[PDB]
């Protein structure tokens, strides 16, 4: 699993 949250 890999995730990036760019607010």
Curated annotation (Swiss-Prot):
What the entry says about post-translational processing?
A: The glycosylation pattern (the amount of mono-, di- and non-glycosylated forms or glycoforms) seems to differ in normal and CJD prion.
Q: How does it assemble?
A: Monomer and homodimer. Has a tendency to aggregate into amyloid fibrils containing a cross-beta spine, formed by a steric zipper of superposed beta-strands. Soluble oligomers may represent an intermediate stage on the path to fibril formation. Copper binding may promote oligomerization. Interacts with GRB2, APP, ERI3/PRNPIP and SYN1. Mislocalized cytosolically exposed PrP interacts with MGRN1; this interaction alters MGRN1 subcellular location and causes lysosomal enlargement. Interacts with KIAA1191. Interacts with ADGRG6.
Part of the intact protein present: 169 to 175 of 253
Q: Where in the cell is it found?
A: Cell membrane; Golgi apparatus
User: In its UniProt record, what illness is this protein linked to?
Assistant: PrP is found in high quantity in the brain of humans and animals infected with neurodegenerative diseases known as transmissible spongiform encephalopathies or prion diseases, like: Creutzfeldt-Jakob disease (CJD), fatal familial insomnia (FFI), Gerstmann-Straussler disease (GSD), Huntington disease-like type 1 (HDL1) and kuru in humans; scrapie in sheep and goat; bovine spongiform encephalopathy (BSE) in cattle; transmissible mink encephalopathy (TME); chronic wasting disease (CWD) of mule deer and elk; feline spongiform encephalopathy (FSE) in cats and exotic ungulate encephalopathy (EUE) in nyala and greater kudu.
Note, other: This protein is produced by a bicistronic gene which also produces the alternative prion protein/AltPrP (AC F7VJQ1) from an overlapping reading frame. The alternative prion protein/AltPrP (AC F7VJQ1) and PRNP have no apparent direct functional relation since a mutation that removes the start codon of the AltPrP has no apparent effect on the biology of PRNP. In mouse and hamster, the alternative initiation AUG codon is absent and is replaced by a GUG codon.
Its biological function? Its primary physiological function is unclear. May play a role in neuronal development and synaptic plasticity. May be required for neuronal myelin sheath maintenance. May promote myelin homeostasis through acting as an agonist for ADGRG6 receptor. May play a role in iron uptake and iron homeostasis. Soluble oligomers are toxic to cultured neuroblastoma cells and induce apoptosis (in vitro). Association with GPC1 (via its heparan sulfate chains) targets PRNP to lipid rafts. Also provides Cu(2+) or Zn(2+) for the ascorbate-mediated GPC1 deaminase degradation of its heparan sulfate side chains.
The protein depicted here goes by the name: Major prion protein
Domain notes for this protein: The normal, monomeric form, PRPN(C), has a mainly alpha-helical structure. Misfolding of this form produces a disease-associated, protease-resistant form, PRPN (Sc), accompanied by a large increase of the beta-sheet content and formation of amyloid fibrils. These fibrils consist of a cross-beta spine, formed by a steric zipper of superposed beta-strands. Disease mutations may favor intermolecular contacts via short beta strands, and may thereby trigger oligomerization. Contains an N-terminal region composed of octamer repeats. At low copper concentrations, the sidechains of His residues from three or four repeats contribute to the binding of a single copper ion. Alternatively, a copper ion can be bound by interaction with the sidechain and backbone amide nitrogen of a single His residue. The observed copper binding stoichiometry suggests that two repeat regions cooperate to stabilize the binding of a single copper ion. At higher copper concentrations, each octamer can bind one copper ion by interactions with the His sidechain and Gly backbone atoms.
- Family assignment from sequence similarity: Belongs to the prion family.
